[PDB]
Design a binder for these strands. Structure first.
Lengths: 176, 38, 131, 141, 202
RNA sequence: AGCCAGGAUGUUGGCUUAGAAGCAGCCAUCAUUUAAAGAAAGCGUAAUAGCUCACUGGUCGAGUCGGCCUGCGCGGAAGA
């Protein structure tokens, strides 16, 4: 509603292609396509984007705000890309990457390999750092969470994968 | 969590969310303040 | 209690104190220390005077409404907080000195020691008057 | 390299400099020893409170030494030895909570206006007047 | 130290368990004497003229007391001799049938210590026995204060002094005597095995 | 709503004068010192630090906040 009542400042240097309800963008980095909800109306109007209630739907403004947020995320994806940083607290937790299939060494008993989707560059600056970059907020977050879910941090020492910013709620075991 | 037939805000940081119709209390301060069904 | 009526009143109630006395001061909100800015506004109240209003109700529109009747350049208050410290025995007294010397140390920042010069005269500070 | 960053309020009445033995040094975070335990308080702890309450700050700075512009004669001792009645809060609503008068106010105004000052010498005087009056009872002299 | 007369018959110096009898030991050697029926630990053996004492007069205080009973009520003589011999061997392990009622109570220095004692009783001096059932002062690192006191307040424990030294914190607490029953082991798991205490009948 | 930050140095309180700590018991004690000082907010509460009761100044461009009555709904709601 408020966010939907605001123009997307699509800079010059990215391709905008709106059609029906299916939307497509083409920036420096990648290419992003998504069909908005039926209750959303879009228009360019001189180097920007609008989202309003297409008539005959009750949550027109809600769907319009969701679409505004999604289109901004896509614009800034193709503009500057996204980047998720992941850390590995835990003894000998390596995150070696070969090709685009991370080889997570969390030492359960067995090897775990994570097949990334298309659009994720997963380098490992240190032994215990992952840096997923790419041009789609949703898939980068979802793959970072599929990783972190391998070893969610524990409350007692924090062993496991965590986002670089994630504050873990470390707690005391017991009196003993 | 807690499946009390009456969920309430036990702390200040508890929030009432209605995912899937089910009215839940989720608290990002104390995990013992996690309740399920209004 | 910085409501609309209290603003309509305190705009003139704060224009008056700087329109009858000397220039006033303004102090931002960046980092006051347990000793530095606390005891510094203490010594400000001590030496400067017991009439200075270190409070800040310096909204841009309230300023343009109340203060700008005299010295109408008060509505640029988009900058930070104001510690209004006037001076009793003439213009640019110990309060102004302390503010101008605090804008660089002994405080967070004094917002360039704003001051209020009724003249807005040519480019010269009040220093060409020796004996 | 600053003033007290080690605020740990555990120090019995000023007969001895910050008496650890009594209340118990639960505030065991103190890096102070027999080097900084007799440097400045031992030599300037006479004309403030000799057997009265004068709360000591926790200043331990990184000049590799301990020194600062210490506060004035503490109003906590001024209004408890200038009173006669050494009472205060706790039993202020039943009986004498200590003595506080205009004479004690003038005393503290002319005494503790050196370093424990506020928005005036008279304003720290009103500070000492509050530390004397909010005891819960005063002698209306 | 004992002011008595001891004599030698077999002198054995060998590996941990083996025993290679020799004829004499010189200064700087370490050997095992035999038939030495009088000297306790830390007591000085010497010729009729040599030092009355040679330092070493201090070893710790037991921290854990439990009672014990054999399978048959009347093997308590066997048990008392076993626990007099093992007590001779370990000076940090007492035994005294407290004459409050009659109960033969065993004071070691740890739960596993007393396990070792009981299984040595069952194996060497074979008597299968099942074990059973003040102003405290504690030192501990200044990180486990909250839990040790939670533990002390968890027990019927009132406290005396909230004083912290410099390499830790000295806790003082008034707790029952029928209580705590394992306070050393509770404390050791609780304190990261880095605390001592004392509980001598306020 | 979202953003630039500021709470004592009479004050272990004059305190159950064993403090039970600028935010244990505690009485109450703005305590000028103010875009602020409560002798008590979650962190250590028995105690620092670094986020900080409270409060506001600075930002920022149209609505926002809680209640009360009411309709129709939602959970409560498991058996062969």
């Amino acid at each position: 509603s408020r966010v939907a009542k605001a123009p997307v400042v699509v800079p010059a240097g990215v391709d905008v292609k709106i059609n029906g309800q299916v939307i497509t963008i083409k920036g420096k980095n990648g290419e992003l396509t998504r069909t908005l909800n039926d209750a959303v109306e879009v228009k360019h109007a001189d180097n920007t984007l609008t989202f309003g209630p297409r008539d005959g739907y009750a949550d027109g403004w809600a769907q319009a705000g969701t679409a505004r947020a999604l289109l901004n995320s896509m614009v800034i994806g193709v503009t500057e890309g996204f980047t998720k940083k992941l850390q590995l607290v835990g003894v000998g937790y390596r995150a070696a990457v070969k090709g685009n299939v991370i080889n997570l060494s969390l030492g359960f008993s067995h090897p775990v390999d994570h097949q990334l989707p298309a659009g994720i560059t997963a380098e490992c600056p240190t032994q215990t750092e992952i840096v997923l970059k790419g041009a789609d907020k949703q898939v980068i977050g979802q793959v970072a969470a599929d990783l972190r879910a391998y070893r969610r941090p524990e409350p007692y020492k924090g062993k496991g994968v965590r986002y670089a910013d994630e504050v873990v709620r470390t707690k005391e075991a017991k009196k003993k | 969590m807690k499946v009390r037939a009456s969920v309430k805000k036990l702390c200040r940081n508890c929030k009432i969310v209605k995912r899937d119709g089910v009215i839940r209390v989720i608290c990002s301060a104390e995990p013992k303040h996690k309740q399920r069904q209004g | 209690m910085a409501l609309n009526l209290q603003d309509k009143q305190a705009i003139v109630a704060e224009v008056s104190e700087v329109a009858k006395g000397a220039l006033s001061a303004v102090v931002a909100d960046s980092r006051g220390v347990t000793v530095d800015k606390m005891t510094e506004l203490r010594k400000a109240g001590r030496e400067a005077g017991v009439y200075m209003r270190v409070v800040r109700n310096t909204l841009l529109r309230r300023a343009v409404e109340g203060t700008p009747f005299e010295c109408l350049k008060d509505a640029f208050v988009g900058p930070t907080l104001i510690a209004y410290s006037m001076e009793h025995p003439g213009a640019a007294a110990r309060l102004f000195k302390e503010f101008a010397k605090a804008n660089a140390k002994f405080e967070v920042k004094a917002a360039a020691f704003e001051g209020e010069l009724i003249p807005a005269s040519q480019i010269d500070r009040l220093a060409t008057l020796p004996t | 390299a600053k003033k007290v960053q080690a605020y740990v309020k555990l120090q019995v009445a000023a007969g001895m400099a910050n008496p650890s033995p009594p209340v118990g040094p639960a505030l065991g975070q103190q890096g102070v020893n027999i080097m900084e335990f007799c440097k400045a308080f031992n030599a300037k702890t006479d004309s403030i409170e000799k057997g009265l309450p004068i709360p000591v700050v926790i200043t331990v700075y990184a000049d590799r030494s301990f020194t600062f512009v210490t506060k004035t004669p503490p109003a906590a001792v001024l209004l408890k030895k200038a009173a006669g009645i050494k009472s205060g809060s706790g039993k202020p609503n039943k009986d004498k909570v200590g003595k506080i008068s205009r004479a004690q106010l003038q005393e503290i105004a002319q005494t503790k206006a050196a370093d424990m000052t506020g928005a005036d010498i008279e304003a720290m005087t009103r500070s000492i007047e509050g530390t004397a009056r909010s005891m819960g009872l005063v002698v209306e002299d | 130290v004992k002011a008595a007369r001891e004599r030698f018959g077999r002198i054995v110096q060998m590996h941990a368990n083996k025993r290679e009898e020799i004829k004499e030991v010189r200064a700087g050697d370490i050997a095992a004497a035999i038939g030495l029926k009088d000297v306790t630990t830390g007591d000085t053996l010497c010729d009729p003229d040599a030092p009355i004492i040679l330092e070493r007069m201090e070893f710790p205080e037991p921290v854990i007391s439990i009672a014990v009973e054999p399978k048959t009520k009347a093997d308590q003589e066997k048990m008392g001799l076993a626990l007099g011999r093992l007590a001779k061997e370990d000076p940090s392990f007492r035994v005294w049938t407290d004459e409050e009622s009659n109960q033969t109570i065993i004071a070691g220095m740890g739960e596993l210590h007393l396990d070792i004692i009981v299984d040595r009783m069952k194996r060497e001096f074979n008597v299968e026995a099942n074990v059973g059932k003040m102003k405290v002062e504690v030192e501990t690192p200044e990180e486990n204060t909250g839990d040790v006191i939670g533990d002390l307040s968890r027990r019927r424990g009132m406290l005396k002094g909230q004083e912290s030294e410099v390499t830790g914190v000295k806790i003082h607490a008034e707790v029952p005597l029928s209580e705590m029953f394992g306070y050393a082991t509770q404390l050791r798991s609780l304190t990261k095995g880095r605390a001592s205490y004392t509980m001598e009948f306020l």
